[PDB]
Each structure stands twice: as structure tokens, then as C-alpha cells.
């Protein structure tokens, strides 16, 4: 059974469990606590109070968020998601993001939307994302490029490989107004993501 | 300015060119008769140049110390005052000064930088009472007076936790008062981070307190109103429960699940609240099934329902969580919890019940580590080994459970074979082939080889984990573990590097933590700080990094590579421990990773012995490689005088053949007969450790033992002091056999593995093996790995 | 409008419309003080005459400079 | 071991103690009869004793004057010389010691010593001197010879900037070349540092020469290459335009702005070179558009380019730079810079198209500011107040504005009501509740409660501003002008704390600039050099430190307090005043703070009056404080006929009202009358000063005409010449009157402040308190601030 716990930074010993996953980065150690110092609440793990902590590492998974924009833009952004290899498959990654939706849709947040960055070949993830109610804004011409492959000069070619959906869940609040169904065909560089 | 001239006084004090030192600052002593900062460098200059020809106390104590009535409010001359003042192991005299010069010349920035100083040496009383000074004079700082009262409490908050022995009886309850009293002052609270500090001050200060509970209870509720937080959630249940009141943790799980929580514990204890207030066991299940509907839990809550109201779970509940959870892999680790009160036959009769195309592989799985039918992992991984072709390649194949428990089981003997060992290699590499994200067996892929000494193999499986950051805390042991004498290679990627990389974490990320600890303070995330004041503490005290630097100091002893630098850090490193007052090692190794009960594990499986350090054997090798520094000189030291007294008090010998291999016991006790007793019975000592035996069958000792010897007879030829002819006959003729044995014995472990390689083929290694339906892998490319160890050992 | 004033150490409270910007860095406290301690006079700011002091921040722009 | 000596001579010197100096000197005389040092100390215990009894020609000027016979190159012997002319104000002879001393006995250390004695005493001619002679003895010395020549030039160009007047016209040309050519003779420049001394001498010491202008160019656009310098850029930028070519200026600039240079200066200047080579207009757009993108600077250019290709500015670029500014602060300042060249029918049209939702308070403030609508400030106020609710603490409110245009049309007026101030404090006092940081209202207050002379009022909102260090030279005015006539309270935090405080800026701070200057020297910083020069003229010059000195030892008299050392103070900052050779004051003051037409409301608004003081004032003041200092010896001094003779001269009664006021002219004409002419009409002066009305409707004057009588009367009484029984029995009754009548007069003001206020709630004062929601406060607190006052000066 999952029980919903905040992130504790000693908990980055107790995430081996988590984080051995090929998928799953361990972000550099200056990355973790930025997000707890300027924004503390919506940093929080998922604890299976069925696994002794005293044995083994309880911790399922944690959720990285950040909010920003302003007025129309402000809006939360799910930056990482990670689920324990035993805990997959039933339904704790909605819970996650359906614990921000509870969290950030009040006082003191109240945001318009929350929106994330997915892969374009991540079909598990995007199937998983629109699944709960998230629909497509814009794709993202290469967002995930390396240092090697530069700054990409057409909007023209597409990688689904290298392209990132911009994916985005409108709150009652924003009406969807910042949402589309048109989204997909949509295309903007890295750089005119600005909030 | 003030800084230009320290580098370079310093610099020329570090090239010991110290006589234009004394000119240079005689030149600014004329230009600046008043500053206090050179007269502080004029001590240092002469301290360095002869520390016993200067009376540390007719210059310094007096001055500066304890009592010292010269009082300064240059930040630099403080600075550097208290610098040096820990460069002596005067930690509590490096901090009096800047409470003395606060006291003298308060300020808000003298304030500060106080409490930065004591923040970055982990005095938490100090950072309370520098707290408290910046309050009084906040009106020039940047921070409302409100916040640095939060900070005495955090600081309040942070002794109690980890330095409690530092405080009398008497001034922890003025401590406790002090903390909430300045925070009550200061409601109504501001912020949700404002409301966990002043419930964390009572909870941990004020425990068993009936008005406590009472109070946090009552603020905590008042909160959930408007906004939900997690701390308050856990502050709120655990006073409730405190309380004793079935009413209110029923109205408190109650507003918290309708806000869309779903929480196990909330329902837990809903659960445990409607029995104490004689609720119907349909009114809750309805209830919860109303507000959560079918989720892991509320299907789970009938099984918890059932043992509260019945003490069995019923077939009803069991089998509608088991519907939709029998294919799942949680379900064993659910269903485990509650089998204490769940029927062994009424679960199987279920399991047995569904049909077989339902059966599938984890269903099975769940059925073998549920105990309900006898281990089938062979057959049960031959009808599911077709879905390893099937599923994606990112995603885990449940047959490792099946195939790592043929590995658990051979190797939970005591003492396995080398044709066992080889026999869970071969089985898990042709899966790893299959499944090379599959951690289970890689893991145990990585830990059989080490066991062999075939580090190589290892690394080559090591470097597809991605190991990194955090991880190299927790996971790097199964390699960097005693490396200097398991594979000596500097100019493998293994060393330069993948070991090179892992040390950021501890050189350049540990360092790094004090700028990250100031923001949150004034950043009021102060929620955070006392789980991030922890990180620190273990991580000096960290297995992993004591380890690493000891284990680096030997290999670089066995190299000839310059351990000047590399002691400064090590002896930096310790000063960094004992200004934290409480001299301790953290083991942060995870061992769950590899299985459930390894804690019982290491004690009794080989498989592990390369990896079984305790702190008894971390803090014995410290003083080998302190001893090793000394030894030049050949006076001894307080600090290592301190040491041993701080070892237990028991004969030496058995205290290392309890912590430390047979061999480094034997190098051990040598070190010290000449640091001792100025090495009478070294003739003996070298003949002893000559005889340990270096056998075919020993594994990773056969490489162990080798360099270990090795390192300790070229640390002896190397030492000047030894002037004895005879002792000096022995040690270089030691060597000699030394060089020369080399081959002989690689040979012969190289001999070994092939004839355990012909044992799997036969008998009943080989007919599994046909059962198997995997075929024995090829002798020559261990072979060369080992060949290629060979190789490394004859080039040292 | 333009005019070059001396940079104050109260001024680091005005300049997030200058050093948000994703190419600029923000140093530490004591970076900026070592600056202003050594160089005093090669610290200065850009200030905009055009904007109202009290309702906004007028600093456009600043120099930090060292002799060596 | 010398100052020890030099300390007991001295220090018995304070008492004196001429037999046991002339016992002692005589016996260190026999030790050292070599020792010129100890027969200079025999002189200055001589002269210290009994000034007229010793031949000044016969004891200093022969030996040691300007045509002196004995030369030492003793260290200690010079600076005690030195000081003991500067002491008898002979300050040619003070530093030509230093040049006698080290033509004879030529060495680096002396030469060093008599540069730092130059550069303490102002006298940029015996620097320039002393930097020769360390280049010449450079290899004793710590830099390399190349730095005194940078000294020498810098020491030229100070002489240049500072002390013009010091040099005849064929002396200018000479240091103008050989700065010039010792510069030259240095090439290739080591760093940028030595490229600004050289681009300094050249446009300062050879105005108007093309091949200098040429000469500046090539050697800075060279140094854009590698390196981006701020004075380098103002230097090319400058002669470019001197040489009247447009292409070269075309090149620095693009090449500037390519380097990521964002500057209006180099955007202008880009566009005027643009133009003269007959560029497109829409060619120079795109290329600004491409290298610099949307900031403030490129919109603002596209109104540059329109003036300068069509002479007015395009309703397409006014619209595209008010789509991002119109609801800036700083688009008010930005656009009324080209008024002239814009239309204010199209201004206005584009100001109404915006959405009633754009139009936030910023936008109505710079329609106020550009003069678009008329005053509405009372509806825009009311419109926008809620705004102060909403706004962060820390940020100043946007509708102050409106507020501050009524307190200004008030406040303009030639004679405001005491009504009129009281509507204007009332308005600004409940503002400042809401907006508690906005300086610019809290200034405003400070200026009106000091026009009321209600200083207690005024201090509580001066401490919340936070004024210090350099603050305090151009601030203070607005409440230490005349205080000691205003608030004589010595046991007040005013006086006490803040006062005092105050001081350190030229009591220390001031007294260790010439270090500072030293260590940029050393340190190659030459860039600042000649500013860091003009912030300590400027601070030894300063309007505000001469007046706060002056009222100190007016406001020490008026105590009866101790002023033996504020006397000694005043006439060592005179000879330091002195030795700079140029006898002014600088007035420091910063009056925009309050108004941008300040200088026009100085000259017409009362409401400063109290803080109007110039020159004339300061030094007329100076010349009362030395006036009476001399009284009771009954000589004159010829020091006071000096300073008497630089006077305007016109009739000393016109010169006093024109630059006093009314008491202060007639206090200065009976001190005056004292030492010109020994009394003879002193009954009709203190029946004069008597006569001068104290009445309830002149503000502050109310206190400062007591306490300036009571100052003058009190001084008379203490005075031991006026012997007349008369004379002292009219001083002794003109005290008993003026002590009689303080409560009257006191008791008069504060009817005519409660008169005042019962006014404010009628009439056009109630209808605009009504209509701005602002409560008329209690007049009570007025009252209080008032009877403190009262009392403060009834106890003196």
C-alpha cells in the first residue's frame, strides 16, 4: 500500500530502489535541493508503509515540479517522474500526478494548467499523459539536442527521437484556454518555450 | 587587498622561503601598525616554520584563547584566527573568538559571519547563540527579526537531534523553553513552514506532553481548512492517535481523504477510528469506496477491514483485491504483510481458480513468493523464458525471480564451491545477454565476480548501471571495496575514470552543501533543513568515502605515487569529523539492493566477505595509514596516542582477526612494533606474515594477500629509519620471493577454474545444465581476464 | 536617459529586470563586495533618469571592472 | 624609540612643562649632540612657551625656511619640522624641507616619504617633484621605475584639474610636455591602466590638436581588438567626433555594439555617422534591430532615427516604443527628452487607444508627467489607492505622485499658511502609513516638520531612511542645518546617537583617504587616482561638514560645554583647507531628491529657508566663531584681518542680511563691534538684537531667534572684558527678559498650530481631506513634539 510523504533530502540515500532505472536521472546534487529551496511543498515521494524501513528502502517514488509564468502562463510544470520497478503498472504514476492536480489546483497555487516535456517517441508515456486528461499543446523541435548535434535551424524537419511534446492538462480555471487540439501540428524552437 | 598578500605570504611560507616573509609583513606592519590580521600572520608564519620552538600558549592563549582578552572585529582577522585555531584542533577556541569579537563589536555582519563560520563547522550550539545576535541587530540585515528567531529554533531543533550529548540536563529544558517561547512570540505564523518548525520544536522537545498534542492538533486542523500539507498530515495523525480520541482522527482522516487523498495511512487510520466509535464494518467500506473508489488501497482496506472486525480476512475481500492484483507484482509484498491472518489453502484455492491464460508470469511469480506451491523455478522459467523475446527492451523480465532463486539458494551456503560459483555465472550472464537492463542479476552478476577477484568482467558490468551521483554512496562498495589490493591497475578506465568521477560527489558536492544549506535558511524552507542538516553528517562519516581515501592511500603507497596532498586531505577530512564533537563512521552501503534478509546475509555468505567492513575496520585502518606518516619522523603522536585509547579494550590481536583479513592483521600489528617498541620482533612479525598461506582456493585472497604483502614490504624498504642489517636481509630477501612467486601462484588459480569448468559439464552441474537449456560459456576469455590480472601483477 | 552612477551595495535589491537574464551571473554577496572593497571606483551602474525611482528599478545596466 | 621621546616632550607640551622639557631636552642633547631632531624639539618647546619672546627669522626661518643653511635627510627631523610649520602656517616652507633634505642626501625611502607628505598636504607640485626623484632612485624601491613616471603625469594632471591658478602660463606647457614625453618614452603600454594616464595627458594637457585627436583614436581602436574598457570607449568616442569623421565613427561604433555593447551613447552616435554617410534609414534600423534585438536603447533609437532623417518623431515608432513603455516608470523621462519632437496630439491619441485594463496606475502617472490631461491627481489617487493594499512592503507606491503634485502646488507658493503645511503634512503622514519605505514622501515630511521646527517629528521619519557614510555629506542638511539653534537637546538620540554617528565620515573616513590613494598608486588603479583626489577635496571642502562643525561649537557655547578641542579641530581642518592652495567651500548637497527644478524652488520656497546657507554664510560664520574665539585676549589676530579682506566689498551690515538672518546679522555685528572697536556701541546692538521679533507665525524661526539671542547674550555674560556695570546689568536683564518671555512665545506658536489645524477641517482644507479619505490626526501629537521643544529650551 502507497503512502504519500514529503521528500526528505536524506531520502536520496533510500532512492537506490528508484534509481538504478536506465530511464530515471540522478540529477546532479546542486539539481535536488533547488527544487526543495524554492519550492518545498511539491517535493514528495511515495513510501509503502508495507516495506520495514529498517530492511529496505520504502520509497516507490518522487515527484520534481516547478511552477512558473505569469498571469495566463502561470502554471505548474512536472519536470521528472519516477515510479520503483516493483510499484509499476499499477497505477501510482497517476496517483502522483493526480496528487499535484489536488495540490496545485488551491491556495496557495491555483494554477491555469500543468504542462510537462515527453519525448515524442515515448509512446508508453504519452498514451499514459493524455490517459488522465493531458492533450498535446505544441511539439518541440529539438529539445533534447546535445551539445554535438547544435541548435536545430528548421522547424522543417522533425526527429521523434529528438522532438519533445510540449504536454499540457488545462485546470477548470484557464476554461482551456491554454490548451488545443490542433497542438501536434504546432511547432516552435526550444528557445520560444518562455514563461 | 587582504587577500592578495595571504596567498602569497602563504606561498612563500608553503616553498618554506620564509625569511623575506618576516620583511614583507615587517613592511606592512610599518605601513598598517594597527591591523591585528598581520600580527595573527606573523604567528602563523612562525608556527610553521617550528612548531615546538613556539609557545602556543604565551602567543596565542592568551591573546585569543578561551580566555584571550585581545578581541578583534576584522571578519579577516577572525577569519583567519579561527582557521588556524582549527588547523591546531582548537575548535572551540576557533569559534570563541567570533562570539568574543561579536560580543565586542556587534553587528549584523560580524552576526552573519559568525554564524556561517559555526554553520560550516557543525557546531549547532554556536549557530543558536549567533542566531540570537543577528535578531538584535536584524534591523540592518535583509531578513525580517522574525526568521533568525525560526533559526535559534532550527538550531535548537538541530542540537537536540545530533549533538544532545553536548547538553546538561539543566539546559536542555532551557533550551526547550527558549525555542517555543521565541516562537510563540511570533503568531500568528506567517507560512506553512512557519507552523512545522513550532510543531516540530514541540513534538521532539515537549514529547508525552498531553497540552502539546492538544495544541498542534488544534493548529494542524485549523490549517486543512484552506490549504493540505504533508507535514501537518503527519504532525495531525501522530498527536491524534496521541490523543486517544477516535472522534477526531476520524474527523481528521475523514476532511483529509475528501480532499482527494489517498492515503493508506489516512485510511488506516479512518479504519482503526470508526471500530473505537462502534461504526458498522459496510458503513466504512462504503464510505471509503464513496470518496476513493478502486484503488491499491480501498480494495487492500477490506482485507485490513476484515482482520479488524473478524480477525480472518474473508474470501469476499480477498478475492476482489485478488481480481484485479493476482497478475501484479506488488501483490506478494500486499498479501506478505497479512499472512498472519490469511488462510494458506483459501488463498491458494483462489490462485488455483483462475485461468490459465490469466496464469501468467508474474502471476506465477506472486504464487512462488507467496510459498504456495513448491519452488518450480526451473520449469517456470523455461514456460516463461518465451517472454523474454517479447518484451521491451527498457523493461524488466520477471524470470530473474525464478532464476535468482537457483542463484540465493546455491549461494546460501556457507562456504560454495568454485564450480558453484562459476555455475550462478554461467546461468546469469545468458539471461543478462536476454535482459541486460535487469538489475536483480546483474547485481549478483556483479557480485559473483568480485568474490572471484575477476574485476574486469565486473567493471565491464558496472560502467551499463550508470552509477552516479547519490548512488555512488550507497552502491560504489562492490567495487572500490578494498580496490589497492584487488586491482591495482592506475591506468585502467576502472581507476582514472569511473573511481575519479565517483570522488566528485565527495570533493567537490560535500563541499559545496554549507552555500546550499545558507540559501534554505534564508529562503525559509526551513521544512527541509533539519532532514539536509543530515546529509552531511553521514556523509564525512560515510562508509564509502572514509573507504575510498584510505583504500587510495595504500594504492598509492603500493604505486610511489605522492601521498603528501593526499594525507593533508585525509588529515582535513578527520579534522572536519571532530569538529562535529561526535567522531563516528555511517554505513550508508545498501544491501537490500542485492536481497531482502541480507542483513543475515553478510554475516554468514563468503560471497561477501570482500565487502564485509565494519566501522572497527574502517577506524583500524585510519591509524595504520596516521601510523605510516609518523613513522619517519618515528616520534609518536597525541592524536594517535588519543586513537588507540578509543579502541576497545581488549588484547590488540583478536580485535583484528575479528575486523580485518588474516593477512592485514598480520601487516597491522607490524606497523606498530616499530612505532611502539621501535621494532625488536620484526623478525618474527615478517616470518609470520611470509607464512600466510597464498592457495589456489582462496579467490579474491589470492589477490588480496599478494598485494597486501607487497604494499607493507615496500612501505618497510622504503622507510629510512630502519638502520638493523638483519631486519633489512629479511625484507629485501621477502621481496625477492615476492617478485619471483608472481606467476607461480596465478598459474595456479588460472589451473583451478578449468577443472570447475570440466565439474559443471559432469554430474549434477551438467545435467541442470542440459535442464537448463543453456550451454557452458567459453574458459579462454575468463582466462585472459585473468591472464590480463596476471598481467597487471608481474608490472608492480 | 541615461546617466552613470556609482554602484551602491543596496542597488544588488534592484537589478532582477538586468541579471534574470539567462546569460547573466548572479555571484555571491562576497563577490560583489571583494569588488566594491578593492575597485570601488570601477563598479558603476547605468541609471535611467526616464523612470520613476519609487515605482520601478532604473538601473539599465552596470560595469564591473578590476586594475591588475 | 624616538616617539616615546617625542610623546613625553609633547605630551608634557600639552600642560608645556618648561623646566622638565628644557632639563630633558638637554640631557638627550648631551647623549645625541649630533642629533638635530632634539634641538628642532628645543625650538618648538621655545615657541610653545612664550610664541612673541622668540625670534621666528632667527629660530626657523634662517636655519630651516626657504632659504635655510641646515639640511637633514633624518625621516623624523622632517615630519616634526614639517608639522611645526604647517603649525605657524608656513606651508611653502613645510614641504620645501623635504626638498632640501633629499636634493643633499638623495634616497628612495626619503623621496617616498616626501611624496606621501606632498600628497597629505594637497600640494600636487611637490608630488610631481618627489615622483622624478623615485624614478631616478627606483632600483631601492618595491615598482618598477615606469609606475613614477604614470605618478608624475597623474601628479601633472592633478596640478592641471585642481590647481590651475598655482601655475603660469610657460610652467603649463612645460609640465604639459614632459608629462607627455615621459609617457612616450614608455611605449609599448603594459595594460590598459597606462593607455588611460596617456589618453588623460593627451586630451586634458593638448585641447584642440587634430593629431592628438588622431593620436587617442588609433591607440584605443587597437585595444578593441582584445579588450572591452569604459574609459577607452568615452576617449574613442570623443576624439572620433573631434576629427570630424564619420566613417571612423561608423566603424568604433558597429565594432562596440558587435561586442555585445547594448549602449544609447554608441546607438546615437552610430545613427549620426549613419546619416553623414547618407545610410537608408531603414539600412541602419535592420542593422540595430539584428545585433542588439528589443531592449529600451533600440526602440528609443528608432525615435533618434526618425528625428534625425525626417526632424520629427513617426507615429509608427512612437507606437512601437509605447506598445512596451507606456505603463513604465521611466517612458515620462523617456519621451519629454523629445518634446520638441513629438506631436502631443498623436502622443495623446496613442495614450487613449489602450484597453481600460492597460491603463494601470503607471500609465495615469506618465499622462500627469507628460502634461497629456490636466491635473486630476485627486480622482487618480482615489482611483488607484487600492493599489497600496496589493503592493509588496518593500516596493514604493505608484500613486505618490498625485500626491506629491498637490503638496508641490502648495508648497510653491511665496508664503505658505501654517494651514497650507499642515494640510500638506496630514496628507503625507497618513500616505506614509501605507507606503512606509517611499523616501521621496518621507523626505518631504523631514523638510515640513523642520520648516514648523518640530525636529523631534522630523527625526522620527530621518532615522527611518537609513542615512549613512557618504549619505551623510549630501543629506544631513535636510535636519542638522542650524540645530543648534533649532533642537539644543545634547541627551536626545538625535545629537547622541545619530549626530555623532554622522561625524565618522570626516573625522575618519576623510583622514584615511590619502592611505587609500597611496595603495591605488602602488597598485597601478590610476584610472581613479584623479577622482579619488576630487571625492577628498570635495570632503574637506564640504558645505555640510564646515556647517555642522560651525553650529558644534555655537551649540557647545550655548551648554556651557567644553570647546577647547572643537576650536583645535576647526583650526587644523582651516590650515588643511589652506594648504590645498584654492580656499572654498563644495556644496555636496543633494536638493534633487525633493524636486528636479529644485534650484528654482530654493530661490522661491520658504519651506527651505532654514536649510539655505551658501558660501558667504558659512565663512561669514567661520569669521564669528574666530571673532569670538579671540575676544578675551582683546587682540587682533591677523588671521580674522585676512579673512575679513576677502569679504565682497560692500557695507559689512548689507553683506550680512543678504546672506543671514535677521538675529544671526545682528549676533555677528555685536561680537564684531567687540573686536573692532572695543564695545563703544555694544548697549544699541544687544537693544537691536532685542528688538528682533519673536512671533508665533514665523515657523522655525520661533526657536532659532530665541536660541540665537540666548546664544549671543550668554556668550556676553561669560565674557571677562566687558567691564562696563551697564553693559553686564543690560546683558544680565536681556537673559532675565528673553528667559521671562519663552513661555509666552511658546504658548503663542502652539495657538496658532492648534488655530491652524481647527482650520484644516473647513472650507477648501476639509473638502480635499474628505475627498482623499485622510483623517485629520490629533493635534496632540503636535503639541507634545512642541512642549519637548519648549522644554529643551527653557532649561538652558
Known sequence: MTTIQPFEPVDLFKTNNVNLDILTENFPLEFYFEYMIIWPDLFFKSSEMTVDPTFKHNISGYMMAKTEGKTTEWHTHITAVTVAPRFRRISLASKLCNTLETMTDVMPHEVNFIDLFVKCNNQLAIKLYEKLGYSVYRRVVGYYNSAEDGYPDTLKKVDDNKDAFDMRKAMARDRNRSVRPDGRSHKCYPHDVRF | MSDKIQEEILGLVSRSNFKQC???????????PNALYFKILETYVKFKQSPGKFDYNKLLEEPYGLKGTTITGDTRSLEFLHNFFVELGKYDEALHVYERGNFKFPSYELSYHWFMKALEDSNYNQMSKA??????????????????????????????RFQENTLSDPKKILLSRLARQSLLDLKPFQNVQ??????????????????????????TFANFDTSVNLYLKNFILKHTKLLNSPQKLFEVCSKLIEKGLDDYELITNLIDAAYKLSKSKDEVKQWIDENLGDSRNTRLARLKLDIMYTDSVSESSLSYYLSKYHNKPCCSIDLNHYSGHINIDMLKSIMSKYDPEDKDLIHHCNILELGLIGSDSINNYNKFKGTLEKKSVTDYSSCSTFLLEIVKDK??????????????????????????????????????????????????????????????????????????TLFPNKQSDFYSKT???????????????????????????????????????????????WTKTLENLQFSR?????????????????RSLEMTQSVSFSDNRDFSILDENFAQFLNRGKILEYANLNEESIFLTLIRELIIEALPNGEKTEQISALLKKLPSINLEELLNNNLTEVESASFLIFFEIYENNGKNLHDLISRLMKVPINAKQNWMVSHTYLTKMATLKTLDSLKRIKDKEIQKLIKNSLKELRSCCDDVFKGYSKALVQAYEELKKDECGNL???????????????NSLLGIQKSVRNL
Open chain 2, 499 to 545: 573511481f575519479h568521477e565517483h570522488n566528485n560527489l565527495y570533493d567537490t558536492s560535500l563541499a559545496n552543501l554549507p552555500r546550499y544549506i545558507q540559501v534554505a535558511f534564508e529562503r525559509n524552507s526551513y521544512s527541509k533543513i533539519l532532514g539536509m542538516l543530515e546529509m552531511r553528517d553521514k556523509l564525512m562519516k560515510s562508509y564509502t568515502r
Open chain 2, 411 to 484: 549461494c546460501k551456503k556457507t562456504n560454495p564451491e568454485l564450480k558453484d560459483v562459476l555455475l550462478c555465472i554461467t546461468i546469469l550472464e545468458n539471461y543478462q545477454a536476454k535482459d541486460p537492463h535487469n538489475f536483480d542479476t546483474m547485481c549478483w552478476l556483479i557480485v559473483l565476480y568480485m568474490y572471484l577477484g575477476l574485476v574486469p568482467d565486473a567493471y565491464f558490468h558496472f560502467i551499463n548501471l550508470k552509477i552516479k551521483n547519490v548512488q555512488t554512496d550507497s552502491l560504489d562498495y562492490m567495487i572500490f571495496s578494498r580496490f589497492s
Open chain 2, 558 to 574: 603500493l604505486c610511489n605515487d605522492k601521498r603528501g596532498h593526499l594525507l593533508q586531505k585525509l588529515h582535513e577530512d578527520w
Open chain 2, 194 to 219: 512557519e507552523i512545522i518548525v513550532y510543531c516540530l520544536v514541540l513534538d521532539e522537545l515537549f514529547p508525552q506532553s498531553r497540552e502539546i498534542s492538544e495544541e498542534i492538533v488544534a493548529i
Open chain 2, 769 to 783: 545444465l542440459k535442464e537448463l537449456d543453456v550451454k557452458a560459456e567459453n574458459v579462454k576469455n575468463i582466462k
Open chain 2, 22 to 32: 618576516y620583511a614583507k609583513l615587517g613592511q606592512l606592519q610599518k605601513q598598517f
Open chain 2, 131 to 160: 542566531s540570537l545576535q543577528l535578531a538584535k541587530y536584524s534591523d540592518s540585515g535583509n531578513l525580517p527579526k522574525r526568521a533568525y528567531y525560526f533559526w535559534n529554533a532550527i538550531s535548537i531543533l538541530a542540537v537536540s
